[PDB]
Motif scaffolding. Sequence first.
Motif, PDB file in Angstrom:
ATOM      1  N   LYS A   1     -15.280 -16.272  -7.517  1.00 24.52           N
ATOM      2  CA  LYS A   1     -15.463 -16.870  -6.182  1.00 24.52           C
ATOM      3  C   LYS A   1     -15.856 -18.337  -6.366  1.00 24.52           C
ATOM      4  O   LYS A   1     -16.971 -18.562  -6.775  1.00 24.52           O
TER       5      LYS A   1
ATOM      6  N   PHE B   1     -15.186 -10.026 -13.778  1.00 22.86           N
ATOM      7  CA  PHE B   1     -15.796  -8.746 -14.083  1.00 22.86           C
ATOM      8  C   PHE B   1     -15.557  -8.429 -15.551  1.00 22.86           C
ATOM      9  O   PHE B   1     -14.489  -8.724 -16.089  1.00 22.86           O
TER      10      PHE B   1
ATOM     11  N   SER C   1     -13.279 -11.578   3.883  1.00 23.19           N
ATOM     12  CA  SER C   1     -13.161 -10.353   3.083  1.00 23.19           C
ATOM     13  C   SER C   1     -13.176  -9.129   4.008  1.00 23.19           C
ATOM     14  O   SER C   1     -13.237  -9.214   5.219  1.00 23.19           O
ATOM     15  N   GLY C   2     -13.143  -7.984   3.396  1.00 21.37           N
ATOM     16  CA  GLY C   2     -13.057  -6.780   4.179  1.00 21.37           C
ATOM     17  C   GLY C   2     -11.671  -6.366   4.563  1.00 21.37           C
ATOM     18  O   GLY C   2     -11.526  -5.406   5.324  1.00 21.37           O
TER      19      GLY C   2
ATOM     20  N   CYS D   1      -8.722  -1.945  -8.630  1.00 21.50           N
ATOM     21  CA  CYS D   1      -8.004  -2.980  -7.896  1.00 21.50           C
ATOM     22  C   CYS D   1      -8.378  -4.351  -8.438  1.00 21.50           C
ATOM     23  O   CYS D   1      -9.563  -4.648  -8.577  1.00 21.50           O
ATOM     24  N   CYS D   2      -7.395  -5.229  -8.616  1.00 22.11           N
ATOM     25  CA  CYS D   2      -7.744  -6.573  -9.046  1.00 22.11           C
ATOM     26  C   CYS D   2      -8.454  -7.315  -7.932  1.00 22.11           C
ATOM     27  O   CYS D   2      -8.203  -7.099  -6.738  1.00 22.11           O
TER      28      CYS D   2
ATOM     29  N   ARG E   1     -15.929   2.897  -4.358  1.00 22.08           N
ATOM     30  CA  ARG E   1     -15.423   3.274  -3.039  1.00 22.08           C
ATOM     31  C   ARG E   1     -13.903   3.282  -3.015  1.00 22.08           C
ATOM     32  O   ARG E   1     -13.231   2.429  -3.615  1.00 22.08           O
TER      33      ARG E   1
HETATM   34  C1  LIG Z   1     -10.077  -4.085  -3.355  1.00 20.89           C
HETATM   35  C2  LIG Z   1     -10.350  -5.151  -2.317  1.00 20.89           C
HETATM   36  C3  LIG Z   1      -9.762  -4.740  -0.992  1.00 20.89           C
HETATM   37  C4  LIG Z   1     -11.851  -5.287  -2.199  1.00 20.89           C
HETATM   38  O1  LIG Z   1     -12.126  -6.369  -1.423  1.00 20.89           O
HETATM   39  P1  LIG Z   1     -13.320  -6.275  -0.371  1.00 20.89           P
HETATM   40  O2  LIG Z   1     -13.515  -4.926   0.022  1.00 20.89           O
HETATM   41  O3  LIG Z   1     -13.061  -7.078   0.717  1.00 20.89           O
HETATM   42  O4  LIG Z   1     -14.639  -6.711  -1.109  1.00 20.89           O
HETATM   43  P2  LIG Z   1     -15.480  -8.031  -0.954  1.00 20.89           P
HETATM   44  O5  LIG Z   1     -14.685  -9.203  -1.167  1.00 20.89           O
HETATM   45  O6  LIG Z   1     -16.063  -8.139   0.337  1.00 20.89           O
HETATM   46  O7  LIG Z   1     -16.571  -8.040  -2.118  1.00 20.89           O
HETATM   47  C5  LIG Z   1     -17.600  -7.117  -2.144  1.00 20.89           C
HETATM   48  C6  LIG Z   1     -18.365  -7.133  -3.464  1.00 20.89           C
HETATM   49  O8  LIG Z   1     -17.580  -6.333  -4.461  1.00 20.89           O
HETATM   50  C7  LIG Z   1     -17.277  -7.071  -5.467  1.00 20.89           C
HETATM   51  N1  LIG Z   1     -15.829  -7.007  -5.577  1.00 20.89           N
HETATM   52  C8  LIG Z   1     -14.968  -7.448  -4.721  1.00 20.89           C
HETATM   53  N2  LIG Z   1     -13.774  -7.136  -5.100  1.00 20.89           N
HETATM   54  C9  LIG Z   1     -13.835  -6.474  -6.219  1.00 20.89           C
HETATM   55  C10 LIG Z   1     -12.913  -5.891  -7.080  1.00 20.89           C
HETATM   56  N3  LIG Z   1     -11.505  -5.958  -6.818  1.00 20.89           N
HETATM   57  N4  LIG Z   1     -13.336  -5.282  -8.137  1.00 20.89           N
HETATM   58  C11 LIG Z   1     -14.611  -5.194  -8.379  1.00 20.89           C
HETATM   59  N5  LIG Z   1     -15.503  -5.710  -7.597  1.00 20.89           N
HETATM   60  C12 LIG Z   1     -15.158  -6.360  -6.511  1.00 20.89           C
HETATM   61  C13 LIG Z   1     -17.652  -8.510  -5.236  1.00 20.89           C
HETATM   62  O9  LIG Z   1     -18.267  -9.117  -6.373  1.00 20.89           O
HETATM   63  C14 LIG Z   1     -18.564  -8.522  -4.054  1.00 20.89           C
HETATM   64  O10 LIG Z   1     -19.872  -8.898  -4.196  1.00 20.89           O
HETATM   65  P3  LIG Z   1     -20.289 -10.458  -3.989  1.00 20.89           P
HETATM   66  O11 LIG Z   1     -20.655 -10.671  -2.573  1.00 20.89           O
HETATM   67  O12 LIG Z   1     -21.491 -10.792  -4.786  1.00 20.89           O
HETATM   68  O13 LIG Z   1     -19.199 -11.370  -4.387  1.00 20.89           O
HETATM   69  C15 LIG Z   1      -9.703  -6.453  -2.743  1.00 20.89           C
HETATM   70  O14 LIG Z   1     -10.209  -6.805  -3.969  1.00 20.89           O
HETATM   71  C16 LIG Z   1      -8.186  -6.330  -2.883  1.00 20.89           C
HETATM   72  O15 LIG Z   1      -7.521  -6.218  -1.959  1.00 20.89           O
HETATM   73  N6  LIG Z   1      -7.622  -6.344  -4.177  1.00 20.89           N
HETATM   74  C17 LIG Z   1      -6.220  -6.247  -4.360  1.00 20.89           C
HETATM   75  C18 LIG Z   1      -5.641  -7.611  -4.194  1.00 20.89           C
HETATM   76  C19 LIG Z   1      -4.142  -7.678  -4.250  1.00 20.89           C
HETATM   77  O16 LIG Z   1      -3.508  -6.907  -3.694  1.00 20.89           O
HETATM   78  N7  LIG Z   1      -3.545  -8.715  -4.997  1.00 20.89           N
HETATM   79  C20 LIG Z   1      -2.125  -8.805  -5.046  1.00 20.89           C
HETATM   80  C21 LIG Z   1      -1.682  -7.854  -6.106  1.00 20.89           C
HETATM   81  S1  LIG Z   1       0.099  -7.894  -6.284  1.00 20.89           S
END
Ligand SMILES: CC(C)(COP(=O)(O)OP(=O)(O)OC[C@H]1O[C@@H](n2cnc3c(N)ncnc32)[C@H](O)[C@@H]1OP(=O)(O)O)[C@@H](O)C(=O)NCCC(=O)NCCS
Lengths: 134, 133, 392, 392
Positions: free
Chosen positions: C19, C181, C121-122, C205-206, C194
């Motif tokens: 971030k 990470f 996010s979310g 998930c990335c 979750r």
């Molecule tokens: C999985 C996903 C939905 C989670 O996002 P989110 O629920 O909105 O989570 P948040 O951004 O609000 O982060 C929540 C906390 O979890 C952690 N975190 C967020 N994403 C993470 C992940 N992918 N893995 C591990 N930890 C994560 C963060 O460190 C954060 O704490 P912080 O406030 O200190 O930074 C999102 O990472 C995602 O969509 N990943 C896939 C992306 C994608 O599709 N890329 C294209 C691929 S082709």
Amino acid sequence: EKEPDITFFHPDILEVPKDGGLPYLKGYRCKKCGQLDFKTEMCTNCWSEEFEMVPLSRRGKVYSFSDIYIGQQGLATPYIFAYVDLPENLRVFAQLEGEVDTYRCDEEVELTLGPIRMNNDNLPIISYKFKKIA
Amino acid sequence: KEPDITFFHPDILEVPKDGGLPYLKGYRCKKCGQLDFKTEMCTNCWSEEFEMVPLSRRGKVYSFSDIYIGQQGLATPYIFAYVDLPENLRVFAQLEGEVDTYRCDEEVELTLGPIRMNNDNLPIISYKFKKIA
Amino acid sequence: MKLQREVYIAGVGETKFGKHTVDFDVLGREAALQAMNGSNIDRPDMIQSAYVGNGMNDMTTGQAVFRGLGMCGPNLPIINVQSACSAGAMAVFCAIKDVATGVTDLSIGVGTENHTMHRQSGAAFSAARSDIETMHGAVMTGKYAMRATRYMHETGATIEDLAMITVKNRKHATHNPYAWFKGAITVEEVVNSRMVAYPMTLQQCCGIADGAAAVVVGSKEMMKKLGIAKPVKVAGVVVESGPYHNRPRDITGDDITETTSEKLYEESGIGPKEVNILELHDAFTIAELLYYECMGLCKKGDGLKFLRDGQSTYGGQCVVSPRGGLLSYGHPIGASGAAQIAQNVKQLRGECGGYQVGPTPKVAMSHVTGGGLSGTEHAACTMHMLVKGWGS
Amino acid sequence: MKLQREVYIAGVGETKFGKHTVDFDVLGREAALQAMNGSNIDRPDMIQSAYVGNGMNDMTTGQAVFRGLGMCGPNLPIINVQSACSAGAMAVFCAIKDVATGVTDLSIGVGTENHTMHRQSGAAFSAARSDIETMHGAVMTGKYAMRATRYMHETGATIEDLAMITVKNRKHATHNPYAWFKGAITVEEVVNSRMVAYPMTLQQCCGIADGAAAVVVGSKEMMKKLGIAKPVKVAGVVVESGPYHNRPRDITGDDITETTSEKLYEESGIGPKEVNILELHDAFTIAELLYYECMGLCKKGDGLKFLRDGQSTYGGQCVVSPRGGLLSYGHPIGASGAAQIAQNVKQLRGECGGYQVGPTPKVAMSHVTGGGLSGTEHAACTMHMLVKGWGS
Ligand SMILES: CC(C)(COP(=O)(O)OP(=O)(O)OC[C@H]1O[C@@H](n2cnc3c(N)ncnc32)[C@H](O)[C@@H]1OP(=O)(O)O)[C@@H](O)C(=O)NCCC(=O)NCCS
Ligand SMILES: [Cl-]
Ligand SMILES: [Mg+2]
Ligand SMILES: [Zn+2]
Ligand SMILES: [Zn+2]
């Protein structure tokens, strides 16, 4: 956000002395090649990172300007902006204080401070502008 | 101020005005025989001449996922799937029902329902698939 | 693409990923300067063309990156490129092509993105803005998750098997300061995080990350002119677009990754069993596991055996995701394709310290796709094959 | 860029420009299909690479265009390009480079955009508050208005002189079905339209529009094999990025347009007085007027006389904006640079009916810029010089 957005622009361009002295714009001269510029991490001519602070003239000259009737979202219209050239051969973009239909090219103007926009907290950002001398 | 769609989409989902059962529509290229969803030109031979083909209301869940983190603005959870039809076409669609209940190769049936809110905050009605009895 | 003459990588650059509060232009400038410094480039007027990849920040990303370096001007044509996640690799590919063809002798590719300062996010990424699947709520998490659901159905593999991908990639990243990470995580912690899109949990998930990377390339003569001690030779590089149709494709295969990797093997003259390290598009745990078979690292049906036997970690046939992959760096769309290459170069050079692969790798492959287009598994794929280019 | 071998344009494609209810992919595909059919291509996979320019529709626009032609796959590497308004011209440039260097013998460039179907906030068309001039309230129309005010100060040009650029360009477009706004408009209508930033009124500003164009390019041998009757030679093509500094500039000049056009004349061996038609970046009336000087059609300070003497319309030294310009088509960001080239080719071939320039032009030049952070005039500039390539 309850951590506040900025209310001033910008400490490396507009020097507001803490003892109440008159504010001034400042530049930074590359110690290797001599290029004067506003503050930058490295000289765009020679990539040196070694500088000297140069206070700039408070008098400048309107090179060109425009009366803005449809402008940026959230700014009160009309407003006026201009290229203001300083005698150190630096050009500053800034709002001009005053009314539409009163500025001309090559008019002399003087530095002043005022609100240039509202910030994310709906509080004014104070910055440099230029105004008519007489 | 002109209104946003409330139905998606007449080129793929037919709703008989007589009240007949809705169906998905395919199109068969008259020149090469390829069946596809509606297109301006055939992806196989570039012909522009087609015949409309009502597609089977029954299909099979090829795969699916239960979605807990959705697109911006979409209520969650929801479910979507690749649904394969007997005509050898794959449809992407939401599945009606609950998380933790679907299985690959499950038979499903076409049904109409809301897929999202439109910009006037009215439901967009579209094609979904549901479990059979 | 066949290279008409040899092309070598001189300096590379990489920001830490995660971030960031500084935007894409600052990140890109930092990586580009690092790559130039690593190439003994000490003046703005040396690089002859620049390509910059980006997803969603800006329509003039590369001009924004190079503005503060004093490099924009009549002797630096800058072109920005996009193919969703392929973009950072396509930027390096374009730079390679300029050198290989003799249009230039010295060029640079940059990949950069800042996502977190420009979205809430979310929510997950949708498919393409104009795509029919986006209308129906498609998100990229679920699009890959569907591949895992089907794979589990067909093979009996469990969510605990898929979780081993995160465990390994995070282990690889333990000592890597660029990753977001990293470190020790158990299968149980991965599986009990979750649910995001069943059966992909959060830790499978990335991340949606910010970062940048850059790669300077030049001719054999230019490497010597610059005093490059460990030039990395581009043995091959391939760009494809993904087949489109609405037929029932086997999503446990991957048409474009299969054909792109085969073409890369054919053009480079290097087969999959000769690859020592591999950075691939591990956007979700399932992707890496499927690509073991798609890329021919092992035979059909042996992907999970390959993983369980240690063949994709230290001491195995091919260390996959030695930097930690997308599952440790997260994935800034425009940056990952270039960042894979920067880390592969460092591994070839023995420069990765506590996460250095031993024995030193001699052959390094990378892979990014780019998607969201209905009827394609991926819209695009770019793969690079790199090899040691300094003798002993 | 010097061309290592001759490159020629075969077929071109062009949609109607305006408000479309079909998206960028449909438009781009229509233009690509026209260009391929106009090249007598019987085997679509003869097209060995494709480049597609876009500004803000999506990250995989070229794959979305070609997927509906059945052309995506291992035999079509697709790269999408961006440099704000330069993108469509850069797409054609990339295709030309592939052919000139022998990477390919036949390639295609497409520029496409649909804006009006999509909610674009207004912040997407501008830089972030991070940009110093934007922090202080800059808007593009005011930046160009300052150029007009300075020009009026130096030359005595009036607002009525500036408005004649809209009048001329709409006149040129009268019988052009592709253009959006066209025909007679009076000077008083232009001058009395709403003031945006003095002296720029609404009718002196190009508007947002939807559209696409495409250009097939190939080697001399490929033109003979395809039976192309009037191949248009690429006499030259140049891409630059805009210099950054904070010294006073003469804003009635244009640093990057000056250097790009001079380099184009030097590489092509064709000077500015030989150019018979010109399409340029008439985003505002004042831009076309200044570019008469910046491109060397006339001397410094003489652009006003050039305009008033009729030298930029039929019968004059160079018919500028014969298709109608951005002031008649509107400006789909990714499309305009490709569309200029498509229409210049049609003019060279004598195909434009009621808006055809007579006598037939033999030399056609095109110009788009794009972007421009603080301290730059523009981020990018792409110019093409095209000439009749068939004998007698
Ligand atoms: C999985 C996903 C939905 C989670 O996002 P989110 O629920 O909105 O989570 P948040 O951004 O609000 O982060 C929540 C906390 O979890 C952690 N975190 C967020 N994403 C993470 C992940 N992918 N893995 C591990 N930890 C994560 C963060 O460190 C954060 O704490 P912080 O406030 O200190 O930074 C999102 O990472 C995602 O969509 N990943 C896939 C992306 C994608 O599709 N890329 C294209 C691929 S082709
Ligand atoms: Cl993808
Ligand atoms: Mg073919
Ligand atoms: Zn210096
Ligand atoms: Zn057909």
